[PDB]
Design brief:
Blueprint (H helix, E strand, L loop, with lengths): L24 E2 L3 E5 L2 E5 L3 E2 L5 E3 L6 H14 L4 E4 L6 H4 L2 H4 L10 H10 L13 E2 L6 E4 L11 E3 L5 E5 L18 H14 L5 E4 L8 H10 L1
Parallel strand pairs: 5-6, 10-11
Antiparallel strand pairs: 1-4, 2-3, 4-5, 7-8, 8-9
The structure holds (2R)-phenyl(sulfanyl)ethanoic acid and zinc ion (2 copies).
InterPro entries: BcII-like_MBL-B1, Beta-lactamase_class-B_CS, Metallo-B-lactamas, NDM-1-like, RibonucZ/Hydroxyglut_hydro
Function: Confers resistance to the different beta-lactams antibiotics (penicillin, cephalosporin and carbapenem) via the hydrolysis of the beta-lactam ring. Active on cephalosporin and penicillin.
GO molecular function, one term: beta-lactamase activity
Length: about 230
């Protein structure tokens, strides 16, 4: 097959799916059981000319298995990069699968310090506050605003489309609050957002951690959730 005007991929179950956001920017969101309920995990996929990329794996290796099988079907390519913001089941849940297909779960040395603490396989663990990533024909750059959703949480930036993917740190507008903050820093969160929205004052789209894509407003709204 070829030459088609279709978008937004979905699995037989529907638990996982994607959506065309930009020329080479997509937003994938999966679902993973938790506390006897369902909890969607927002994400993002890059369509480079040297292998797709994931801004975050699935909840579990068995869950991400169906996630990668999707991107590697319409993008006539394969995933060989996995950016991890923080150490969580919704970040490195598929760390096992990433090391089975030759994929690399990029992440900061800290993001791994918590991974092994949970039982994961620990990501690459070789990053810093900021890292200008470049895959084939794409431009990306990490950033560490501060402590918010996790002790090792960071936001993703794209110096070309102005698309920021804060994640769990940048809550959506529809959201009402932050929620469980057992392993989070509500006192530092306000400081983190103030660093993200400041680092870039020309964002075109913002993708939260649990909800839907929006805009730079998400950052401003997040503060309201703390205050
Ligand atoms: O609440 C969050 O942002 C993280 S990703 C989480 C952890 C456990 C269950 C649901 C969500
Ligand atoms: Zn998380
Ligand atoms: Zn999340």
């Amino acid at each position: 097959s070829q030459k088609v005007e279709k978008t937004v991929i979905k699995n037989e179950t529907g638990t996982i799916s994607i959506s065309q956001l930009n020329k080479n920017v997509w937003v994938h969101t999966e679902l993973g059981s938790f506390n006897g309920e369902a909890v969607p995990s927002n994400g993002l996929v890059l369509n480079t000319s040297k292998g797709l990329v994931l801004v975050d794996s699935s909840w579990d290796d068995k869950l991400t298995k169906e996630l990668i099988e999707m991107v590697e079907k319409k993008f006539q390519k394969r995933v060989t990069d996995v950016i991890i913001t923080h150490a969580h089941a919704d970040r490195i849940g598929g760390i096992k699968t990433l090391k089975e297909r030759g994929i690399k779960a990029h992440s900061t040395a800290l993001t791994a310090e918590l991974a092994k603490k949970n039982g994961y396989e620990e990501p690459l663990g070789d990053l810093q506050t900021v890292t200008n990533l470049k895959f084939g024909n794409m431009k990306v750059e990490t950033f560490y605003p501060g402590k918010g959703h996790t002790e090792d949480n960071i936001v993703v930036w794209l110096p070309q489309y102005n698309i920021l993917v804060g994640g769990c740190l940048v809550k959506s507008t529809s959201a009402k609050d932050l929620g469980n903050v057992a392993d989070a820093y509500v006192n530092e969160w306000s400081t983190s957002i103030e660093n993200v929205l400041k680092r870039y004052r020309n964002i075109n789209a913002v993708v939260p951690g649990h909800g839907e894509v929006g805009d730079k407003g998400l950052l401003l709204h997040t503060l309201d959730l703390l205050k």
